[PDB]
Amino acid sequence: SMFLPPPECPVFEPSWEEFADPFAFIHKIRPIAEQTGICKVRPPPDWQPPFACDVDKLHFTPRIQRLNELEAQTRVRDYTLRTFGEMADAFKSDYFNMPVHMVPTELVEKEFWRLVSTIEEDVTVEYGADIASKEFGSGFPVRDIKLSPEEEEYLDSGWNLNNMPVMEQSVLAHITADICGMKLPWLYVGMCFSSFCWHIEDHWSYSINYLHWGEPKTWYGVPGYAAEQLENVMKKLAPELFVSQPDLLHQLVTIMNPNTLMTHEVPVYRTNQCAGEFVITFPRAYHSGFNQGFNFAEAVNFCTVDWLPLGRQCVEHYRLLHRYCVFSHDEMICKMASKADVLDVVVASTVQKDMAIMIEDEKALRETVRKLGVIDSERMDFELLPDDERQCVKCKTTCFMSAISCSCKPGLLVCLHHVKELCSCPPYKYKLRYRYTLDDLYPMMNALKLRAE
């Protein structure tokens, strides 16, 4: 009746021993947590990073949000942290005519789903979302200011979210392409009912979220295996979200009742994340939620060796949908192979397996365009080109291994799947532009094999 809360997602309480290495722990819980999409992690009781900030000197620009189910919103005036906190507390307090910490969490959840479904409520809220900067920085300790002995303790923690991208069990790391939205932590200031719509991470990566302080955050999550099942339910009830988006900054997303999904046999899980807890989302796991009140959270994307195959399948899927990429997956693979001597040995072994698939697909593709009559060729350093200067005119994929050009249409490229879409000239006028010959590639893969012994 009205709202039936989904079943709870798994909650983990690792010992200090298990907690020490984040990457080993995530790998251990993976068979459980990948069945539910999200999961929650309670750190050992004495792991408590200091949070310190001046509420008057931190300022940020707020986003405004309307709260209607199935209405399109796009992914990605001034407040100090204090003035925002005052606005947010007054708002919740007046909405319920109660002291903000006496409003039960079950009630806010029930009320959230009522107000987004009711056509005649026009409730709007405000929130903060931004990567770290000079005006507003990480809530975790970072180097700069003289630090206290306890701040120093957490500087090199694996669960300090600043460190997590640049550790060596992670495969974004040795990458230099500066895909900034994905190596840097985002900061989120919440108030009651402020919401994050249904979505998955760029390139189907993991994410990890830490709530520093304040009232809880409520999550809904769907396992990766049910991603297409959820998208079919979404297309049927709100097709406007699926019209082709011009850019990467034009992704359309929405609020949708998890009960609607469960009615159509999509598995949904929930949790309340409290201050000092982590939530982790797994590859291709849809998630959404809202805040119970005034709070402060920090989040980061990351990629493990487990993810490498999915990362390839994802870029393939982007091509079918003509979606833009954040980075080139093959460029990342080749960059790791060129640094094979300093890679973790398990990393090296997993990269090698992906590289073997890459090379075999590339061989087949070059044979196919040769038989279409493209004969001329020249080496080309794709990584020097700005990304928007090396997308396939048809499918918008970011080229790195190879592309086709023509003197007729200067500066345009197509990937090798779309040779017929460049122009109307005969194929002998075309040129195959390539980063590596097959003979360059096999020694790069052999270096990985040696490093992996």
Give the annotated binding-site residues for Fe cation: 199, 201, 287
Q: Contacting Cl ion (CB under 5 A), which of 13, 56, 106, 121?
A: 121
**3-state class (DSSP) for residue 197:** strand
Structure tokens at 73: 């919103």
Nearest to 115 by CA among 269, 3, 218, 262: 3
Comparison of 6 and 22: residue with beta carbon closer to ligand 7SI: 6
Helix, strand, coil percent content, the chain, rounded in steps of 5: 35, 20, 45
Q: Compute the distance between CA of residue 72 and CA of residue 245 in angstroms, rounded to an integer.
A: 12
Comparison of 123 and 365: residue with beta carbon closer to Cl ion: 123
Size of the site for ligand 7SI (CB under 6 A): 7
- Min. distance of Cβ 261 from Cl ion in angstroms? 19
Give backbone dihedrals phi and psi of 119, rounded to 5 degrees, phi first. -65, -25
Give CA separation, 243 vs 2, 199, 222, 261, in Å.
Answer: 31, 16, 23, 21
Q: Compute the distance between CA of residue 225 and CA of residue 240 in angstroms, rounded to an integer.
A: 24
Nearest to 398 by CA among 286, 314, 281, 295: 314
Cβ 257 vs Cβ 230: under 8 Å: no
Q: Contacting Zn ion (CB under 5 A), which of 197, 333, 406, 441?
A: 406
**3 binding ligand 7SI? (CB under 6 A):** no
Q: Per CB under 5 A, which of residues 176..205 are in contact with Zn ion?
A: none
Binding at 41: pick from ligand 7SI, Cl ion, Zn ion, none (beta carbon under 5-8 Å per type): none
Nearest to 209 by CA among 400, 218, 432, 393: 218
**68 binding Cl ion? (CB under 5 A):** yes
Q: Per CB under 6 A, which of residues 258..317 are in contact with ligand 7SI?
A: 262, 265-268
Cβ 350 vs Cβ 364: under 8 Å: no
Q: Compute the distance between CA of residue 227 and CA of residue 398 in angstroms, rounded to an integer.
A: 24
**7 binding ligand 7SI? (CB under 6 A):** yes
Comparison of 68 and 229: residue with beta carbon closer to Cl ion: 68
CA triple 270-274-277, angle to 5 deg? 95
Comparison of 40 and 319: residue with beta carbon closer to Zn ion: 319
Comparison of 191 and 422: residue with beta carbon closer to Zn ion: 422
Task: Give the interface segment with Cl ion, choosing from 66-74, 216-224, 291-299, 372-380 (CB under 5 A).
Answer: 66-74
**256 binding ligand 7SI? (CB under 6 A):** no
Q: Contacting ligand 7SI (CB under 6 A), which of 6, 216, 221, 293?
A: 6
Q: Compute the distance between CA of residue 167 and CA of residue 208 in angstroms, rounded to an integer.
A: 15
Q: Per CB under 5 A, which of residues 413..452 are in contact with Zn ion?
A: 415, 417-418, 423, 425
Nearest to 218 by CA among 198, 195, 185, 186: 195
Q: Contacting Zn ion (CB under 5 A), which of 394, 427, 436, 449?
A: 394
Cβ 294 vs Cβ 89: under 8 Å: yes
Size of the site for Cl ion (CB under 5 A): 2
**3-state class (DSSP) for residue 407:** coil
Comparison of 240 and 316: residue with beta carbon closer to Cl ion: 240
- Min. distance of Cβ 209 from ligand 7SI in angstroms? 21
Q: Compute the distance between CA of residue 206 and CA of residue 28 in angstroms, rounded to an integer.
A: 15
Structure tokens at 189: 């200031």
- Min. distance of Cβ 266 from ligand 7SI in angstroms? 6
Binding at 423: pick from Cl ion, Zn ion, ligand 7SI, none (beta carbon under 5-8 Å per type): Zn ion
Comparison of 268 and 414: residue with beta carbon closer to ligand 7SI: 268
Identity (one letter) of the amino acid at 95? Y
**251 binding Cl ion? (CB under 5 A):** no
Q: Per CB under 6 A, which of residues 168..227 are in contact with ligand 7SI?
A: none
Give CA separation, 448 vs 30, 329, 338, 355, in Å.
Answer: 26, 17, 9, 9
Q: Which residue is nearest to ligand 7SI (CB)?
A: 267
Q: Contacting Zn ion (CB under 5 A), which of 408, 420, 437, 446?
A: 408
Residue ranges that bind ligand 7SI, judged by CB under 6 A: 6-7, 262, 265-268
Residue ranges that bind Zn ion, judged by CB under 5 A: 392, 394-395, 406, 408, 415, 417-418, 423, 425
Residue ranges that bind Cl ion, judged by CB under 5 A: 68, 121
